[PDB]
C-alpha cells in the first residue's frame, strides 16, 4: 500500500527513465508489453510491484510515471519502441516547440501551457494511490526545458501537496567537459529554484561516471546508455527496501531525518560498488569489507568531487544480497579506524545502515555482471562546495560582460533575476563554510 511517483522531464530525464523502467520491468518480471506471463513465474510474494505499478484489474500493469518534453522526437521514439503498449497514451505529454536551451523560454513562455496538463495528470495519478511515500523527479540541470519545467513543477507541487517528500536526481555539468556554452546560467538559476523546493538532491555529473566506466568496466567508447544503466542500478538499489523484505528496512522518510542536518544543506553525492565485468568478477570473493572499501574509495564517486578536500557530515549505506550485520559492523569499524577519512566532531556516529535480501538483477546485453552482494552509498560532506565555487567562477566570467543576457531578458525575465540567484549561491557557500568549521 506504499506508492511513489516518478517524474521524467527533459531529454536526459526521459533517456534515464527508459533505462530505469526497463530495469524495473525486468526485475519484477513484467514483459515489455505489460503482461505478466501466464506461466514461468520468477518471484514469489504479492504486491511487490505495487510500489511502482498499478494493477489494471485484469491482466497488465501500468507504471506510475509521466513523461514530459517540449520536443516530440524522444517521445515519438518511445511510442514507436517495444514499450508502446506499456505506458498509458495520455502520460507521454509532448509539446510542439522546444525551449532551445533557454531557461526563460522553459519557465515563462512555453511551459505555462503544458504545466496545467502535467499537474492534472499528476492529480489523476495521485488519486489512485493511498499511501503515497513521495515523488521522484529526474532532470538534466544544464538544459533549458529541463531546468525551467522542473522549477515550475516543483514550485506548483510544493503548494498543491505541501509536506509530501520530493526527491530530485539531477545531472550537473562537468567541471570542464560540456556540450553547451550557456549552461552555467541556467544551472545557477535552476539551483536557486530547487534549493528551496527539493527535499533531497543528488549530484550525478557525467565525467566521473565516464571515468568509472573506463576504469572498472573497461570501456573506451561508451555511450549515454551505460551511464543511464548505472544510474538505474543506483535507483533500484535505493528503492529495493520498499518492495523487498530485509533485516533492516529503510523508508523514503528515513533519509531527510538522518542525512539533512539543516534545511538548507540537502545536496549529496552517491557511490556504488561493486562495478565489475564478467571477465574478472568471479576470480575474487567480493567480500563485504572489500566492496565497502571500494565504495568509500574516493575515485569511485559518481560526481567529480574529492571527499578528501572536506569533512563528512553523515553517511547512508544500503547493502543488498546476503550480507551479515556483524560483517557490516566490522567494516564500519575499519572505516572509522582509517585515518584519511575524517568526520565532523558534532557527529560522533555518522552511519545509517540498511540490509536487504534481494540481490541486484542483471539486464541481458548490459555491461555489469551478477554478484551476490552490492552496496549503494549516499553521503553528505563539506567537499561539495568546490562544484558551486567553480560554477560561480564560470558564471561570473560570462556575466561580467553581460553576454547572452538578451536571449533571457527578451522572454519576460527581469534583469536582476541573475543577481539574486548569484548571492543565493554565495550564501550557500558561506553556509557550508560556517557548518564545516570546528568547535
Amino acid at each position: 500500500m506504499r506508492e511513489v511517483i516518478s517524474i521524467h522531464v527533459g531529454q536526459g530525464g526521459i533517456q534515464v527513465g527508459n533505462a530505469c523502467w526497463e530495469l524495473f520491468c525486468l526485475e519484477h518480471g513484467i514483459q515489455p508489453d505489460g503482461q505478466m506471463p501466464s506461466d514461468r513465474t520468477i518471484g514469489g510474494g504479492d504486491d511487490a510491484f505495487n510500489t511502482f505499478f498499478s494493477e489494471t484489474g485484469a491482466g497488465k500493469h501500468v507504471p506510475r510515471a509521466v513523461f514530459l518534453d517540449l520536443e516530440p522526437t524522444v517521445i515519438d521514439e518511445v511510442r514507436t519502441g517495444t514499450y508502446r503498449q506499456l505506458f498509458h497514451p495520455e502520460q507521454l505529454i509532448s509539446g510542439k516547440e522546444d525551449a532551445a536551451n533557454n531557461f526563460a523560454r522553459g519557465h515563462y513562455t512555453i511551459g505555462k501551457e503544458i504545466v496545467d496538463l502535467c499537474l492534472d495528470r499528476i492529480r489523476k495519478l495521485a488519486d489512485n494511490c493511498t499511501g503515497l511515500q513521495g515523488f521522484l523527479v529526474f532532470n538534466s540541470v544544464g538544459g533549458g526545458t529541463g531546468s525551467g519545467l522542473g522549477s515550475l513543477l516543483l514550485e506548483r507541487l510544493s503548494v498543491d501537496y505541501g509536506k509530501k517528500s520530493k526527491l530530485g536526481f539531477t545531472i550537473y555539468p562537468s567541471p570542464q567537459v560540456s556540450t553547451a556554452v550557456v549552461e552555467p546560467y541556467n544551472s545557477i538559476l535552476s539551483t536557486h529554484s530547487l534549493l528551496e523546493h527539493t527535499d533531497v538532491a543528488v549530484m550525478l555529473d557525467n565525467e566521473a561516471i565516464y571515468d568509472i566506466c573506463r576504469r572498472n568496466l573497461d570501456i573506451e567508447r561508451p555511450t549515454y546508455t551505460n551511464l543511464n544503466r548505472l544510474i538505474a542500478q543506483v535507483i533500484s538499489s535505493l528503492t529495493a527496501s520498499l518492495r523487498f523484505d530485509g533485516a533492516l528496512n529503510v523508508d523514503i522518510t528515513e533519509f531527510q531525518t538522518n542525512l539533512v542536518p539543516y534545511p538548507r544543506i540537502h545536496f549529496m553525492l552517491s557511490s556504488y560498488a561493486p562495478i565489475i565485468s564478467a571477465e574478472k568478477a568471479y576470480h575474487e570473493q567480493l567480500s563485504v569489507a572489500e566492496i565497502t572499501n571500494s565504495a568509500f574509495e574516493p575515485a569511485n564517486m559518481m560526481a567529480k568531487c574529492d571527499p578528501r578536500h572536506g569533512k563528512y557530515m553523515a553517511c547512508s549505506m544500503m547493502y543488498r544480497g546476503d550480507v551479515v550485520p556483524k560483517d557490516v559492523n566490522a567494516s564500519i569499524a575499519t572505516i572509522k579506524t582509517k585515518r584519511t577519512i575524517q568526520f565532523v566532531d558534532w557527529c560522533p556516529t555518522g552511519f545509517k545502515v540498511g540490509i536487504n535480501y534481494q540481490p541486484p538483477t542483471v539486464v541481458p546485453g548490459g555491461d555489469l555482471a551478477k554478484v551476490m552482494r552490492a552496496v549503494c552509498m549516499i553521503s553528505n560532506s563539506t567537499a561539495i562546495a568546490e562544484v558551486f565555487s567553480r560554477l560561480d567562477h564560470k558564471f561570473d566570467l560570462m556575466y561580467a560582460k553581460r553576454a547572452f543576457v538578451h536571449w533571457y531578458v527578451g522572454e519576460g525575465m527581469e534583469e536582476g533575476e541573475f543577481s539574486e540567484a548569484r548571492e543565493d549561491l554565495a550564501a550557500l557557500e558561506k553556509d557550508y563554510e560556517e557548518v564545516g568549521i570546528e568547535t
Binding site: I42, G43, G44, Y282, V362, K370
Partner: protein, 49 residues
Amino acid sequence: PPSQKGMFNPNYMSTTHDTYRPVNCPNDVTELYQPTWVKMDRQVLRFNA
C-alpha cells in the same frame, strides 16, 4: 556451440604452446567458468495447494 579453434596450425606453433599441452583433461576447456548461483538465476517452480 563452442568457438571454432579449427585453425590450429602446427607449423606456427610456439615452443611453449607445444610443451604445456592440456594435462589431466580430455581436451582444451573453452567455456568460461561461472558459479552455480549465476547459472540458476530466476528459476522458480510453482505449485497449487
